Design a protein around this nucleic acid. Structure first.
Ligand SMILES: [Zn+2]
Ligand SMILES: [Zn+2]
Length: 55
RNA sequence: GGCGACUGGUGAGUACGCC
């Protein structure tokens, strides 16, 4: 919860974007330009996802 | 450490790159 929690990076962090460890989304090494990391469709984003809990 | 880039869908910045 605390910001200091991120200090876990000292022993590998948890990227809440890619999921990988060692780094954080804040600075993910994902060589991506722009894509929906919610569905997995490049060109758009989650905020612009087509399957966003919409019936 | 600094910077750059970025995204903020991003912990706030340094995992990357370099020295
Ligand atoms: Zn990542
Ligand atoms: Zn989508």
């Amino acid at each position: 919860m605390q910001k200091g929690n991120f200090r876990n990076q000292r022993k590998t962090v948890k990227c809440f974007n890619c999921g990988k460890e060692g780094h954080i989304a804040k600075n993910c090494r994902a060589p991506r330009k722009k894509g929906c990391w919610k569905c997995g469709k490049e060109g758009h984003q989650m905020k612009d996802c087509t399957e966003r809990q919409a019936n």
